[PDB]
Amino acid sequence: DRGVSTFSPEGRLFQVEYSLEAIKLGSTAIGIATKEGVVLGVEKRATSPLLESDSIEKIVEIDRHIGCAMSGLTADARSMIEHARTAAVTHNLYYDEDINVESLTQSVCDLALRFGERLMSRPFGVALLIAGHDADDGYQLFHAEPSGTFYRYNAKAIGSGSEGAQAELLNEWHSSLTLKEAELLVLKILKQVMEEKLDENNAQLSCITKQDGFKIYDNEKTAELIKELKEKEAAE
Amino acid sequence: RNNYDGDTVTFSPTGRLFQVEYALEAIKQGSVTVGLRSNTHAVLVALKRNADELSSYQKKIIKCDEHMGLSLAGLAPDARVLSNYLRQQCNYSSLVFNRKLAVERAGHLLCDKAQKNTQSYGGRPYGVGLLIIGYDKSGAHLLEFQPSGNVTELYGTAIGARSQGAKTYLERTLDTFIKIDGNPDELIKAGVEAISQSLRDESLTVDNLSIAIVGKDTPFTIYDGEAVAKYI
């Protein structure tokens, strides 16, 4: 049993690369950027029917202008969120201004590598879609991995469905998309890759806009959005 | 090798430190970047890499002071660490001594920081390569940093995958571009050609090209996007 910080002979850190495998098993999550806001959606995927699917929180607020969606070992995400929320509040205490979306992303990724034998014992087993707005670079969507790296995406899907769902987004995404177009498109792609029939109970929508900040859609709103999507499809 | 590469505190029976060597392999997987200098300026050209048609392009150039910067190829997290430590040294020198940190001394400080992680149990070597440029009291400078700890002063070089292309070109054009003094736009072009010799099924665009320059009376500044249009 070698050491957690060990390099492989091909130039990769074992524990980080194994960590990326665990992410592949996670419930799906998708985010889309539009000049009208940014949309985050998640497969809830309850295990038993007795599980109250409201207590399944895979979309969380970081600040009024920054939201986060997770996929992977979700218990590992509690403290990344806690740090992110603290970085958002601290930056405001020190500078009387909202933190930039990328600056908060950079802060989250700095935790990712603080393991060894070096406070944490192992990398995080969870990836993040971080969506937000600031006044320098408008609406933004970022993908943060337990490798410590991150990319800005116009749209990105992580988890079980990702490999295929991403190829879908590369075809469907354009810069003049609207908020409602990306809402449905997130519902669509999710419905294709989930194993259950998607309904307003095993899937969850939410967005971030400058004017209204980050809201998680209540079941009613999402349902009225699922129907509208079933209809646009039957209209072939 | 199996028996001699589970940490940086084990020598191979032939004298190698595999953990350091496996670290260098990460650099070779990074995207190509070039550095070169005249007697008056020093230039970085870097090929930025994206993940999707939908993702951004990973930054490769980092300002360290008004007179010093580097480009990175390899584990980007590690470059953040090292570039941060370099900014700190630049800043300490400025604050305590009212003295700009000499580029040679940055190299020395860098080398020693990295060497700690080839004698440390429980640590790992750094997985990144750095090209450092700056203008100090002894002129223009270009340094090559390797995760082994070896920092080297050169007239030019390139690191990363397919880096040999740019490397051989600079060895060929050497006597020509050293003399490119007092013409920055013409030195950048020299660098842009060198990095071009390293493409394979890819052409430089405004989205993937990134260029930095510094020298006498030209503080280290970074051009991305529309700024780099001029040079293609």
Partner: peptide, 6 residues
């Protein structure tokens, strides 16, 4: 392939 390298 690998896009974990800058």
């Amino acid at each position: 392939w690998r896009s974990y390298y800058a």
